[PDB]
Each structure stands twice: as C-alpha cells, then as structure tokens.
Design a protein around this ligand. Structure first.
Ligand SMILES: Oc1ccccc1F
Ligand SMILES: Oc1ccccc1F
Lengths: 122, 122
C-alpha cells in the first residue's frame, strides 16, 4: 500500500501515461476489478475491460499536472491537472481533479474525476 | 442542492472566509451535523461545535485558490488551494485539495482535505 511519497509518484506517472496515450500502461495501473467515475456523479465503470474501453474512446491529447499531488497516509491522493484535446477540429482544454484510492498492491482501486462543463474551455 | 455553478460559488466563498479568518461565517457554511476529515486519513470530526474548535485552533493566515473549482452535477466539488501561515515564527505554505459534498440546503455535509507533510513548505 503506497506511502504518501509513493502515491505522489504513482499519480504523477498516471498523468504521464495519459499524456502519451498509452492505453495498455494506463489500464495496468488499475486493479483488475477497479472502478472509474468520470465525471464524478456519473455511474461507475467496473473492471479493466470497461476501463480500457473508456480510455480508448477518450484518448492528440496532452495532460499535465497544474499543481502538486496531495497524498494521504492511507493510500489515497488527489491532484489537479489540465487535459488538452481536439474536439470537432476545435482544440479545447478541460481542468480536472482526480481523487484515487490505491490498494494493498499499489494498483488504483477507485478513480473519481471531478469536473463539469464549467471546466471546459474551447 | 447546489448546481455545478453554485458549488463553484460556495467553494470559492469558503476559501475567501478561510482567508479572512472568519470562524463563525465558516462554521455557518457547514451542516449542523457535518463532518470534517483534515487531513484525509485522520478520524472525522462531527458537528458545528467540534468544527468551530478545529478552525479556531487552525486559524495571520492567507488562503487562495491555485486553480479552478471542479464541480459535479450531484452537489459535490473539489478545489486546489494554498494556505500560508506562520509556524514557530517560520512562515510556511501548505498545498491542499478539498473535496466537499453539499446537502439539499446548500450546507457542507462532508469536507475531506487532502494533504500530507509532503505538501508543506517552510
Ligand atoms: O483521469 C482523467 C480524467 C479526465 C480526463 C482524462 C483523464 F485521464
Ligand atoms: O479546508 C482547509 C484545509 C486545510 C487547511 C485549511 C483549510 F481551511
């Protein structure tokens, strides 16, 4: 179960994997039965196959942290970042905060991505 | 129950109240039986009297948002901010993300403040 420093490293590497768009490496960060709520407020998606389908649909994309990872001492953390993408030939940016809980093996057990339309910029 | 735009306004006003240090106005934002986990990972504190005691102990302090509020459509949001304080005559800064759930009256029902020692700068 990752320490606070290890959560900082894992969550930063998640953003680097989203940024390059390595779907298979992203999926491997998740527990095999993880859930993703993205955006938070919508129903969870369950397990690596569903999660892979989500990232493949969603991911030229750039992602970068826009402030430090905030980690806890119970395997969780939160981070702010910006995703830039191209939508109907119109580039846009989305500001997001992800909250993650890691399991006892260092895998993401739950992902909650906070954002709404108010965080999109076209 | 606040809409996404209303969550953005409520969470920004919370930071303005922390920044000026108005304990009674901060406490009034919370539901009478709210909980606070600060830092997340520690046991919750319950109800306005406990919450007032927490802010009075904790709060010259400056607080400002360091990126936009990320709101949901189910009365929740998350925000990144920086708190500057004076510790043993040594000014320091703490980077934090608060995750809030508001109730059906617009009051904070749950507060979870993500940060650890790794987010403190002396
Ligand atoms: O975790 C995420 C959240 C929002 C958009 C892309 C992501 F990879
Ligand atoms: O919500 C908070 C979190 C951390 C420090 C001060 C705060 F007011």
């Amino acid at each position: 179960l990752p320490t606070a420093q290890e959560v900082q490293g894992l969550m930063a590497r998640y953003i680097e994997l989203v940024d390059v768009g390595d779907i298979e490496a992203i999926v491997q960060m998740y527990a095999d039965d993880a859930t993703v709520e993205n955006p938070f407020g919508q129903p969870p998606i369950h397990g690596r196959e569903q999660i892979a389908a989500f990232y493949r649909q969603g991911l030229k994309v750039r992602a970068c942290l826009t402030g430090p990872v905030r980690a806890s001492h119970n395997g969780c953390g939160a981070m702010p970042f910006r995703v830039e993408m191209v939508w109907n030939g119109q580039p846009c940016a989305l500001d997001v905060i992800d909250v993650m809980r890691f399991d006892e093996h260092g895998r993401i057990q739950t992902m909650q991505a906070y954002w709404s339309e108010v965080n999109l910029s076209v």
